[PDB]
Amino acid sequence: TIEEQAKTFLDKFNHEAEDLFYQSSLASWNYNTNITEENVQNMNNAGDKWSAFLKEQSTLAQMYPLQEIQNLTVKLQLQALQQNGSSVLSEDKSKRLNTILNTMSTIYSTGKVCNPDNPQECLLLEPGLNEIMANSLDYNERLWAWESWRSEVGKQLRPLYEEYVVLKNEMARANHYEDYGDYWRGDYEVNGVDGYDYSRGQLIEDVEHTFEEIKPLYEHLHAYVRAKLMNAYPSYISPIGCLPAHLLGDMWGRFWTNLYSLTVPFGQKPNIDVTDAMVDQAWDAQRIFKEAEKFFVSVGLPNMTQGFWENSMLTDPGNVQKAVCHPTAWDLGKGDFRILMCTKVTMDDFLTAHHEMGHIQYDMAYAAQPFLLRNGANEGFHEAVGEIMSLSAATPKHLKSIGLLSPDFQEDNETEINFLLKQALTIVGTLPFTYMLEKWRWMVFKGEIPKDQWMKKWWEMKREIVGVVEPVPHDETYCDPASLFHVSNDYSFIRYYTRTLYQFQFQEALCQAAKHEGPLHKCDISNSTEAGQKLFNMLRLGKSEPWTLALENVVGAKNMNVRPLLNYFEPLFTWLKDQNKNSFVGWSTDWSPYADQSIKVRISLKSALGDKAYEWNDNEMYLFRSSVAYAMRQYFLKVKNQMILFGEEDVRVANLKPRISFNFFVTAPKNVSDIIPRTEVEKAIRMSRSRINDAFRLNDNS
Amino acid sequence: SALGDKAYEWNDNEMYLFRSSVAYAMRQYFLKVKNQMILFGEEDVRVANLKPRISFNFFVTAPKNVSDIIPRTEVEKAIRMSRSRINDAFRLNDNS
Amino acid sequence: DCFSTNILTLINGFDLPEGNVTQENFVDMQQRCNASDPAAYAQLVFQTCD
Numbered sequence: 001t002i003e004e005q006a007k008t009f010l011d012k013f014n015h016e017a018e019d020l021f022y023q024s025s026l027a028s029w030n031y032n033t034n035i036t037e038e039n040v041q042n043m044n045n046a047g048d049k050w051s052a053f054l055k056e057q058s059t060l061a062q063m064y065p066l067q068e069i070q071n072l073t074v075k076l077q078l079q080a081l082q083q084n085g086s087s088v089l090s091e092d093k094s095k096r097l098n099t100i101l102n103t104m105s106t107i108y109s110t111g112k113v114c115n116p117d118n119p120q121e122c123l124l125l126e127p128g129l130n131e132i133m134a135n136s137l138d139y140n141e142r143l144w145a146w147e148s149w150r151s152e153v154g155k156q157l158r159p160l161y162e163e164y165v166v167l168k169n170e171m172a173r174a175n176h177y178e179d180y181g182d183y184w185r186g187d188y189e190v191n192g193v194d195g196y197d198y199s200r201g202q203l204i205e206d207v208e209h210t211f212e213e214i215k216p217l218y219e220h221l222h223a224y225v226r227a228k229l230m231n232a233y234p235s236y237i238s239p240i241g242c243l244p245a246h247l248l249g250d251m252w253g254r255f256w257t258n259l260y261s262l263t264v265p266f267g268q269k270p271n272i273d274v275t276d277a278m279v280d281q282a283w284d285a286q287r288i289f290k291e292a293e294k295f296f297v298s299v300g301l302p303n304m305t306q307g308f309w310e311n312s313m314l315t316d317p318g319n320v321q322k323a324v325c326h327p328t329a330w331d332l333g334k335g336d337f338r339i340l341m342c343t344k345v346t347m348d349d350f351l352t353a354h355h356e357m358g359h360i361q362y363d364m365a366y367a368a369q370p371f372l373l374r375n376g377a378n379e380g381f382h383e384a385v386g387e388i389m390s391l392s393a394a395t396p397k398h399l400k401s402i403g404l405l406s407p408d409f410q411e412d413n414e415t416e417i418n419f420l421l422k423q424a425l426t427i428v429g430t431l432p433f434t435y436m437l438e439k440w441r442w443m444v445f446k447g448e449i450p451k452d453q454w455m456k457k458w459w460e461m462k463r464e465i466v467g468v469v470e471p472v473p474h475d476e477t478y479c480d481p482a483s484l485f486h487v488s489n490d491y492s493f494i495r496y497y498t499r500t501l502y503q504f505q506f507q508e509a510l511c512q513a514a515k516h517e518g519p520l521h522k523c524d525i526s527n528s529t530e531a532g533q534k535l536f537n538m539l540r541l542g543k544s545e546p547w548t549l550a551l552e553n554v555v556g557a558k559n560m561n562v563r564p565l566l567n568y569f570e571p572l573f574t575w576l577k578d579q580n581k582n583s584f585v586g587w588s589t590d591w592s593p594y595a596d597q598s599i600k601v602r603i604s605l606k607s608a609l610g611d612k613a614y615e616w617n618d619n620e621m622y623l624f625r626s627s628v629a630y631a632m633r634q635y636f637l638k639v640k641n642q643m644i645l646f647g648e649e650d651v652r653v654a655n656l657k658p659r660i661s662f663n664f665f666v667t668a669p670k671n672v673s674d675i676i677p678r679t680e681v682e683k684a685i686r687m688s689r690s691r692i693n694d695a696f697r698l699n700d701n702s
Numbered sequence: 703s704a705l706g707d708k709a710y711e712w713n714d715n716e717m718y719l720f721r722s723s724v725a726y727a728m729r730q731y732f733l734k735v736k737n738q739m740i741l742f743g744e745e746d747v748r749v750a751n752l753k754p755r756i757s758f759n760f761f762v763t764a765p766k767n768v769s770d771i772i773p774r775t776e777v778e779k780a781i782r783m784s785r786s787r788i789n790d791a792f793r794l795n796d797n798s
Numbered sequence: 799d800c801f802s803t804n805i806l807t808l809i810n811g812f813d814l815p816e817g818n819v820t821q822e823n824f825v826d827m828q829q830r831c832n833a834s835d836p837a838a839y840a841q842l843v844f845q846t847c848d
């Protein structure tokens with residue numbers, strides 16, 4: 001034999017697949033570098049040819065067993081080609097799932113919200129709303145943008161998400177997997193090696209363990225940020241409560257980077273800025289690539305092929321042609337690699353060059369491996385290599401060495417603290433979010449959370465794990481998590497966790513091979529033959545062996561570790577502990593931004609009516625909201641001499657209980673930021689309590 | 703007649719309450735008989751021919767479809783089901 | 799009336815359904831309530847009447 005024709009078929013398939021993959025890569029590259037519709041079909045059908053190999057996979061599902069393939073490489077290729085994917089589903093259900101995915105992507109891409117007073121112009125997400133959430137310092141504008149995007153897009157995306165989870169769970173179950181979360185976790189699963197095994201379930205607990213070593217540091221950071229926000233929005237944040245969700249620098253809270261301008265430890269002394277000196281030296285956007293390649297080869301890495309220099313999309317010509325130049329390392333193959341990234345004169349592009357060249361160095365290091373094994377160990381390694389490369393290339397001693405950052409300057413530690421906090425606002429502000437989101441998705445797929453408690457669990461975990469409180473209550477008609485890009489478009493989110501750890505581990509081990517003395521964040525990598533050899537003893541491995549062996553070949557560890565990150569951020573930890581003498585480190589999960597003006601209501605049907613008492617459902621809640629709106633209308637008309645059109649959408653309700661007890665508050669009709677104070681609501685209820693009571697057959701005690 | 707003295711005035715807020723009550727009645731009928739959950743609102747109850755006698759015509763439409771009108775028989779059935787609550791919301795009893 | 803007052807105090811304290819606790823299933827529900835959420839029941843002042 002079986003192994004013989006197994007190998008022979010693998011060889012034949014590799015021969016017939018490499019050439020067409022090469023052609024498809026050329027077609028895609030030509031599409032990307034020059035946006036012409038005329039050749040799009042010319043490449044689209046080309047992709048169809050690659051889809052032909054899909055049916056060829058059908059030839060390895062019937063007669064090829066599993067337990068008889070003792071050898072490792074052939075087994076790995078066979079199981080990498082054996083999976084059916086979504087083909088096991090029926091045709092009608094398959095087309096239903098495809099149209100659901102397309103509908104969700106289209107709804108996310110072309111959703112619009114606009115002002116309550118000038119509805120003639122509306123805003124998309126990527127321009128307009130993102131700029132509002134990143135730049136604006138107005139509480140009301142941020143609240144409006146947050147709540148409006150939530151309302152429109154989430155309320156559109158909820159039922160499609162329900163059907164999507166049902167169909168995906170069915171497809172995963174019919175594919176020898178427990179649930180869809182199990183299918184996603186199967187990427188890390190390693191078996192049949194007797195000593196390096198890694199179960200699918202185990203990963204879960206490992207992640208949890210890691211978070212247990214992050215909660216202290218994050219807590220301190222959280223507290224610090226809270227204090228620095230109290231000046232920006234006074235009388236809006238409680239010092240012993242969670243942070244409001246719309247003040248975190250962007251729409252969802254994935255990163256806290258945009259808070260940096262508000263939370264500089266020492267704003268008088270700026271950090272390193274060298275693009276002015278780079279402009280003064282008058283270097284074209286070609287020499288920086290050569291210098292970065294020289295730095296890459298100085299550590300012992302192999303020289304870069306001439307083909308990359310000969311043909312590449314390096315700098316935009318600036319002619320009438322307007323094509324997207326988003327950074328990307330193209331690995332068409334057979335020694336043909338390219339870089340697609342628009343070059344400016346900034347630090348950001350200078351480091352992105354290092355990131356992309358680390359990507360391509362990784363990708364080209366293991367070109368000898370088979371085509372099916374031509375990928376990184378898992379989803380976290382490929383970006384981790386680039387991250388460590390960029391981190392090593394950004395040290396101030398590197399700037400001093402490369403001729404920039406003139407020697408007449410002393411590296412004071414205040415700028416180092418500024419840099420450490422800037423790094424922490426990005427690296428450390430996203431781990432709780434990623435953990436909580438993937439946990440929510442895992443429990444939703446697993447069936448732990450019922451379909452009537454998605455939002456309840458979402459906001460409970462938000463208040464408990466991340467310490468972030470919603471500014472307005474959100475019932476079960478919302479689908480806030482589906483408003484993320486990665487959730488609606490069916491993408492995995494756990495990689496951004498594991499990668500965030502892996503890189504730091506590498507950043508220790510390699511920088512330990514260079515015999516560093518001072519702090520970790522100030523150490524370098526250049527000219528370290530032993531470190532280069534240690535890295536290359538993992539780069540060329542690819543997918544041929546389990547990722548545990550690859551990790552051990554660099555750090556000597558069998559799993560992910562959190563210690564190197566804490567050693568990286570130790571100086572900032574000490575400074576934060578010193579700076580939080582008076583602040584209450586932690587948060588309380590009972591304060592809400594709207595909880596000051598709420599009114600509690602308790603209803604006792606069995607006491608008032610005894611027998612023949614009606615049941616309480618959402619229609620009774622609708623009637624109660626209408627009654628409160630009527631009362632508020634009457635009070636505003638008959639006393640303040642104003643006519644205001646209150647509705648049942650202006651009465652916000654929270655904390656519904658089987659006792660029939662809940663809190664509510666009232667807002668102005670077309671303004672979520674305007675809340676009627678509790679005194680006016682009390683006066684209106686006093687005025688119209690008799691009608692409110694007799695609408696429900698209850699009398700002032702029930 | 704029903705209240706005699708200390709009878710309230712009838713303004714557009716009372717019309718809003720009446721529309722909300724009719725929407726609630728239609729919601730309850732559709733949930734408890736046809737086994738469907740439909741979100742009727744006060745914007746689906748269309749009112750015409752208001753008079754100082756307080757007499758008017760009304761009809762109901764589907765929540766997001768102006769071309770869909772609930773036939774009069776279903777509206778009669780829903781009113782029959784929820785007439786006691788509709789009456790006692792306004793302090794009137796089956797003859798006023 | 800004293801027993802009814804005690805039942806009402808517990809129900810308001812822990813927001814249980816109104817018709818779930820009665821005259822005879824009061825001690826077991828009280829035990830369940832303190833086991834479930836300790837240190838919040840202690841805020842309740844319970845009177846004894848026999």
Ligand SMILES: *[C@@H]1O[C@H](CO)[C@@H](O[C@@H]2O[C@H](CO)[C@@H](O)[C@H](O)[C@H]2NC(C)=O)[C@H](O)[C@H]1NC(C)=O
Nearest residue numbers: 029030031033034035036039317319320321323
């Ligand atoms: C993108 O790059 C250039 C745009 O400057 C275009 O190149 C054309 O390529 C063919 C082959 O040399 C020439 O015959 C045409 O005269 C070129 N001009 C045209 C028609 O645009 C083209 O748009 C793209 N190049 C490709 C697809 O290879």
Ligand SMILES: *[C@@H]1O[C@H](CO)[C@@H](O[C@@H]2O[C@H](CO)[C@@H](O)[C@H](O)[C@H]2NC(C)=O)[C@H](O)[C@H]1NC(C)=O
Nearest residue numbers: 003007010070071072073074075077368369370
């Ligand atoms: C399993 O099959 C692999 C190939 O998939 C075999 O590996 C080859 O081994 C021979 C001799 O050991 C070498 O000449 C080749 O370089 C190896 N790889 C190639 C290119 O086929 C291997 O023989 C089998 N089992 C082992 C021992 O790995």
Ligand SMILES: *[C@@H]1O[C@H](CO)[C@@H](O[C@@H]2O[C@H](CO)[C@@H](O)[C@H](O)[C@H]2NC(C)=O)[C@H](O)[C@H]1NC(C)=O
Nearest residue numbers: 058060061062082083084085087088174175176
């Ligand atoms: C992938 O697809 C193949 C065929 O499409 C599936 O194989 C079926 O396996 C069952 C149980 O052994 C047989 O009774 C069927 O006759 C096979 N084909 C049919 C008609 O579905 C199988 O679900 C998948 N194989 C693997 C390894 O996952």
Ligand SMILES: *[C@@H]1O[C@H](CO)[C@@H](O[C@@H]2O[C@H](CO)[C@@H](O)[C@H](O)[C@H]2NC(C)=O)[C@H](O)[C@H]1NC(C)=O
Nearest residue numbers: 266411412413414415416417519571574575578
């Ligand atoms: C980091 O910089 C701060 C401020 O520059 C240092 O804080 C010291 O605090 C004592 C007590 O007032 C003073 O001597 C100075 O304010 C600071 N001393 C020095 C030498 O800077 C802090 O010691 C520095 N931490 C380091 C270098 O690890």
Ligand SMILES: *[C@@H]1O[C@H](CO)[C@@H](O[C@@H]2O[C@H](CO)[C@@H](O)[C@H](O)[C@H]2NC(C)=O)[C@H](O)[C@H]1NC(C)=O
Nearest residue numbers: 291294295297298299400401402403526527528
């Ligand atoms: C690291 O590699 C670089 C590559 O040569 C070395 O940097 C040069 O060092 C010389 C020695 O005086 C300087 O004069 C040159 O200006 C440096 N090159 C550049 C481009 O600035 C460096 O010496 C190497 N480190 C080791 C281990 O020797």
Ligand SMILES: *[C@@H]1O[C@H](CO)[C@@H](O[C@@H]2O[C@H](CO)[C@@H](O)[C@H](O)[C@H]2NC(C)=O)[C@H](O)[C@H]1NC(C)=O
Nearest residue numbers: 740762763764765766767768769770771772773
């Ligand atoms: C709005 O209501 C009208 C009628 O209630 C719907 O029109 C009917 O649509 C069905 C299904 O497409 C057809 O079989 C009928 O012939 C249509 N006309 C009538 C008068 O019944 C219409 O589809 C509804 N629109 C929406 C979005 O639900």
Ligand SMILES: *[C@@H]1O[C@H](CO)[C@@H](O[C@@H]2O[C@H](CO)[C@@H](O)[C@H](O)[C@H]2NC(C)=O)[C@H](O)[C@H]1NC(C)=O
Nearest residue numbers: 828829830831832833835836837838839840844
């Ligand atoms: C409710 O829980 C409290 C805990 O505060 C119970 O009290 C304690 O019970 C232990 C016995 O295991 C005693 O040693 C303590 O003296 C008790 N008081 C404390 C810790 O303050 C209490 O008994 C329970 N309430 C009832 C039903 O009596």
Ligand SMILES: *[C@@H]1O[C@H](CO)[C@@H](O)[C@H](O)[C@H]1NC(C)=O
Nearest residue numbers: 294297298300301302303304
């Ligand atoms: C890599 O290739 C370039 C060719 O320009 C050469 O100058 C350089 O010395 C090579 N790097 C080595 C040999 O380390």
Ligand SMILES: *[C@@H]1O[C@H](CO)[C@@H](O)[C@H](O)[C@H]1NC(C)=O
Nearest residue numbers: 658814815817818819827830
């Ligand atoms: C009444 O108490 C039991 C046991 O505690 C529990 O089912 C629930 O709290 C109540 N029963 C129902 C049907 O709600």
